[PDB]
Amino acid sequence: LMLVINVVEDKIPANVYPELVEWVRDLNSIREEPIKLTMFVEDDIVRGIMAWEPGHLVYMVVPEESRRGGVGRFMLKYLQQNSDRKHVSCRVHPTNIPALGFFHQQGFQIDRWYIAADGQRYFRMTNYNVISSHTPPEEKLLTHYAESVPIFLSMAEGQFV
Amino acid sequence: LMLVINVVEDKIPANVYPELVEWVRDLNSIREEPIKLTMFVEDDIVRGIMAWEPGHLVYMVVPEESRRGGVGRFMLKYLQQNSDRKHVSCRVHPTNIPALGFFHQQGFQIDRWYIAADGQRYFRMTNYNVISSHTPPEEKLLTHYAESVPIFLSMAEGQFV
Ligand SMILES: CC(=O)SCCNC(=O)CCNC(=O)[C@H](O)C(C)(C)COP(=O)(O)OP(=O)(O)OC[C@H]1O[C@@H](n2cnc3c(N)ncnc32)[C@H](O)[C@@H]1OP(=O)(O)O
Ligand SMILES: CC(=O)SCCNC(=O)CCNC(=O)[C@H](O)C(C)(C)COP(=O)(O)OP(=O)(O)OC[C@H]1O[C@@H](n2cnc3c(N)ncnc32)[C@H](O)[C@@H]1OP(=O)(O)O
């Protein structure tokens, strides 16, 4: 029922959205095929907006009032269905741990890290399924001990102190 | 009301918990002061167990049935109150994104990354408050556009198709 509409980038009113027009132009200056800018609309609410191309997510945002409702999951699946082998790459700053949690829940893992030219740090997250996930052995050892060890300690303050 | 008890490491029954005894011994083989192993008990349930020393978290686990109840937050605060300047360091595998979300919510950030000798990757997370958090400018540009742009599209299937 949700409406999926693409933004005609050359018809974006530059007098109203100057910075957005510049950001989109700079993205397309290094590209043969132009980037896509897609909005996901319910009634009179833009539930989410996503800048993307087949196989790569540039940026996406769900406005705060629409979060934790599956909108982000819907946009990423729409991106995969328009992607070769449904494989997608993205970039996330290491401080954006909430976004890391979102992508991780969607089957993505950190497979590259680097420092950009201006000094910023970034992770690449993909769903290529090469990275192995590793659970340390001490987690099981501690869990079994915590559940199984006998404890005979009684102390509550009631009639005595 | 929760009981906080330290495990006497030399009295751990080696016949019952051989691997745990070995893991604790290997941790203490490179240490002057021995590690601490603390359990957090409610009634007959060990809500959480934590291997730690002042200023450094080695490992902690809340059993699945006790999670998302603040137990993990309670243990980390207990660790800070027994830490110089309440500063703590920890190590998290990059695939353990759920743990990254937990520590991030407690005021921690990734401040170091490395590859260990056996090939494993790790982040160091601290609450030292040196790392700056960075929100990209395009998040605001996309949010303002999504909320403000006029949209005159009407399409619902009712009396017409
Ligand atoms: C686009 C890039 O490459 S990086 C920049 C990412 N965008 C941003 O950071 C902008 C600010 N944040 C947002 O707009 C949104 O929070 C997004 C885009 C990250 C996710 O949008 P949402 O619609 O809220 O995600 P969605 O509702 O589909 O949640 C799916 C699962 O992802 C996980 N998840 C989502 N958000 C979070 C979070 N903040 N922390 C931890 N896990 C999360 C949860 O497991 C969630 O399932 P649940 O709600 O049942 O617990
Ligand atoms: C110890 C180290 O250095 S690394 C290894 C960490 N331990 C493990 O991975 C073992 C398996 N996991 C666990 O035992 C637990 O999930 C822990 C220890 C990570 C956290 O224990 P919990 O008691 O569940 O954490 P707690 O209830 O205090 O939650 C505090 C906040 O942290 C965040 N948080 C906690 N768990 C998660 C998660 N799985 N994903 C994203 N965010 C989380 C939430 O914001 C939560 O607040 P909320 O419940 O209101 O949403």
Side-chain angles (χ1 to χ4, degrees), chain B residues 5-134:
Chain B
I5 61 187
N6 294 304
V7 174
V8 187
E9 278 146 28
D10 46 300
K11 296 215 193 83
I12 301 182
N15 51 321
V16 180
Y17 308 109
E19 309 113 299
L20 174 66
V21 165
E22 169 59 34
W23 181 70
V24 172
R25 181 212 60 82
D26 187 60
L27 287 177
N28 292 328
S29 58
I30 59 187
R31 278 181 166 80
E32 277 294 303
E33 188 72 24
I35 214 69
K36 279 218 169 185
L37 189 59
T38 307
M39 289 188 303
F40 295 74
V41 182
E42 178 186 339
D43 290 339
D44 63 346
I45 302 163
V46 179
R47 291 293 189 188
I49 184 168
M50 175 173 73
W52 65 283
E53 57 199 347
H56 182 61
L57 164 62
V58 177
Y59 210 86
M60 84 189 286
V61 47
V62 174
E64 196 161 339
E65 62 273 21
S66 289
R67 276 170 203 174
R68 307 307 292 258
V71 184
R73 180 173 56 241
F74 184 87
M75 296 197 268
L76 197 54
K77 283 173 181 334
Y78 174 85
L79 171 43
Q80 294 176 7
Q81 262 154 7
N82 285 267
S83 283
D84 198 284
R85 258 152 276 207
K86 293 153 113 132
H87 283 159
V88 177
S89 61
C90 77
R91 293 185 175 170
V92 187
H93 197 271
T95 55
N96 198 353
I97 290 172
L100 299 181
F102 165 73
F103 291 118
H104 172 78
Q105 199 66 22
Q106 315 311 308
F108 286 66
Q109 295 278 15
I110 302 171
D111 66 354
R112 273 167 203 186
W113 64 43
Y114 71 94
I115 305 172
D118 55 347
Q120 321 206 35
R121 311 165 252 111
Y122 288 102
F123 299 138
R124 192 185 85 156
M125 290 192 82
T126 70
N127 61 345
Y128 299 165
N129 292 311
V130 178
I131 290 289
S132 268
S133 168
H134 160 257

Side-chain angles (χ1 to χ4, degrees), chain A residues 76-144:
Chain A
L76 197 55
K77 283 173 181 334
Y78 174 85
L79 171 43
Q80 294 176 7
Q81 262 154 7
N82 285 267
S83 283
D84 198 284
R85 258 152 276 207
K86 293 153 113 132
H87 283 159
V88 177
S89 61
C90 77
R91 293 185 175 170
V92 187
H93 197 271
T95 55
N96 198 353
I97 290 172
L100 299 181
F102 165 73
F103 291 118
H104 172 78
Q105 199 66 22
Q106 315 311 308
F108 286 66
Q109 295 278 15
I110 302 171
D111 66 354
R112 273 167 203 186
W113 64 43
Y114 71 94
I115 305 172
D118 55 347
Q120 321 206 35
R121 311 165 252 111
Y122 288 102
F123 299 138
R124 192 185 85 156
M125 290 192 82
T126 70
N127 61 345
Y128 299 165
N129 292 311
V130 178
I131 290 289
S132 268
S133 168
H134 160 257
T135 286
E138 59 257 52
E139 182 169 321
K140 185 43 222 161
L141 304 184
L142 292 171
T143 298
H144 173 248

